[PDB]
Design a protein around this nucleic acid. Structure first.
Ligand SMILES: Cn1cnc(N)c2ncnc1-2
Length: 231
DNA sequence: CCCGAAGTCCG
DNA sequence: CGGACTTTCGGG
């Protein structure tokens, strides 16, 4: 079975505009885990737009197929485009897509893709269906996969006043001993972000519970101005 | 325009 | 460790 024509068209059009000179530092920035074509986001968005204008966006029956085929292509711009395309199908994504999103998290994994999946697509799903959190989060924390662990930390990132504080702190407590940078930093990030909504609770948490030094410092990057740094 | 959100380099 | 500085991206 041939590649979906929309994906083939995108591949052809991206490749025709590749920039090997830019590709080298772009790939180095992601620690050479991926090949790059060398197309940065403004042009990459326009090239996608070009193909939608010519071909139209595929029927929703093909949504998951298109995403997978792009995920399987070697150059990282195709996963970035896949995520742009998933946003175009946003109104069709629901709680039944959690396993599909899980599989995207644990394939071609790195912070650029995982952070584009978790606080937005998964965050929205669990905001609407909080009763499903306990069907996934314990497994993610227990897994060997640091990107599922990061997903458990960051899916609430944008919740603001809808944050489940008890859940957030329980998740952080489970992962606070991790020596993995991407886990320590995610803990720092979600605490720093939630402190914009409720600084008192984050300050109390970091003063009274164990965290990696990186996590604590990132958490209080801003609110240390509000409380002061004791001698 | 601005500000806030990985990478290298240094002490 | 933790700060200074880097380029890119999202968004006010
Ligand atoms: C991706 N990226 C680029 N530049 C910065 N200053 C950043 N801080 C966090 N993440 C960043």
């Amino acid at each position: 079975v041939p590649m979906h024509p929309f994906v083939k068209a995108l591949q052809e059009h991206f490749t025709a505009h590749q920039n090997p000179e830019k590709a080298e530092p772009m790939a180095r920035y992601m620690k050479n885990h991926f090949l790059f074509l060398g197309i940065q986001t403004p042009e990459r968005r326009q090239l996608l737009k070009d193909i939608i204008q010519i071909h139209t966006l595929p029927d929703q029956k093909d949504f998951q197929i298109i995403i997978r085929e792009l995920w399987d292509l070697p150059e990282r711009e195709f996963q970035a485009a896949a995520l742009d395309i998933m946003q175009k199908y946003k109104k069709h994504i629901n709680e039944t897509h959690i396993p599909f999103l899980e599989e995207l998290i644990v394939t071609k994994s790195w912070w650029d893709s995982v952070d584009s999946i978790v606080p937005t697509f998964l965050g929205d799903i669990f905001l609407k269906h909080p009763e499903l959190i306990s069907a996934y989060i314990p497994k993610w924390i227990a897994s060997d996969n640091i990107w599922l662990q990061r997903a458990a930390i960051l899916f609430q990132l944008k919740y603001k006043q809808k944050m489940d504080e008890e859940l957030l702190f329980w998740i952080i407590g489970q992962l606070h001993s991790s020596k993995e940078f991407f886990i320590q930093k995610a803990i720092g990030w979600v605490l720093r972000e939630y402190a914009k909504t409720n600084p008192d609770v984050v300050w109390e948490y970091v003063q009274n519970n164990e965290l990696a030094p990186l996590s604590k410092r990132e958490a209080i990057k801003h609110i240390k101005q509000n409380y002061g740094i004791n001698n």
